[PDB]
Design a protein around this motif. Sequence first.
Motif, mmCIF file in Angstrom:
data_model
loop_
_atom_site.group_PDB
_atom_site.id
_atom_site.type_symbol
_atom_site.label_atom_id
_atom_site.label_comp_id
_atom_site.label_asym_id
_atom_site.label_seq_id
_atom_site.Cartn_x
_atom_site.Cartn_y
_atom_site.Cartn_z
ATOM 1 N N UNK B 16 0.825 -1.196 0.000
ATOM 2 C CA UNK B 16 0.000 0.000 0.000
ATOM 3 C C UNK B 16 0.864 1.252 0.000
ATOM 4 N N UNK B 17 1.989 1.230 0.721
ATOM 5 C CA UNK B 17 2.903 2.365 0.651
ATOM 6 C C UNK B 17 3.426 2.605 -0.757
ATOM 7 N N UNK B 18 3.903 1.538 -1.400
ATOM 8 C CA UNK B 18 4.390 1.682 -2.763
ATOM 9 C C UNK B 18 3.320 2.169 -3.724
ATOM 10 N N UNK B 19 2.107 1.620 -3.609
ATOM 11 C CA UNK B 19 1.017 2.012 -4.500
ATOM 12 C C UNK B 19 0.632 3.468 -4.292
ATOM 13 N N UNK B 20 0.639 3.920 -3.039
ATOM 14 C CA UNK B 20 0.392 5.327 -2.764
ATOM 15 C C UNK B 20 1.371 6.198 -3.532
ATOM 16 N N UNK B 21 2.670 5.914 -3.395
ATOM 17 C CA UNK B 21 3.648 6.758 -4.086
ATOM 18 C C UNK B 21 3.463 6.711 -5.604
ATOM 19 N N UNK B 22 3.228 5.524 -6.161
ATOM 20 C CA UNK B 22 3.179 5.434 -7.618
ATOM 21 C C UNK B 22 1.954 6.167 -8.171
#
Lengths: 111, 22
Positions: B16-22
């Motif tokens: 979820x952290x990675x998806x937020x940034x992308x």
Amino acid sequence: EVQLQESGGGLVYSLRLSCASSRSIDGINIMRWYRQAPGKQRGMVAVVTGWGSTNYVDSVKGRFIISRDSAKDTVYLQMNNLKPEDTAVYSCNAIYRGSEYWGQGTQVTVS
Amino acid sequence: QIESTQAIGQRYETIHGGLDSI
């Protein structure tokens, strides 16, 4: 399934730090500390297990210590030798059936 | 089983952290 609690903020000219633990104590296989200077990767600092093991990271010999109170479901790590860089976001986890376990952490200071 | 799904739990917080940034 474990939970993790800590302590140890602020600055002193003494010196203080620790954490705690939650669930089914003395399943204390690899129960290890971590530390993260902000904007850097993760990092493990000190490792202590049930069998009185004692080994640390290349930076905290002299600077630190591990302790293990089996009574109140906790493991201790007490800072020594003030130097600010140790300021970071922390963590203090363990291993149980090999499951990734993790907590929240605490910060450190200057002067 | 349970150990795998707990690894999975933490690892989707990473997701979820990675998806937020992308």
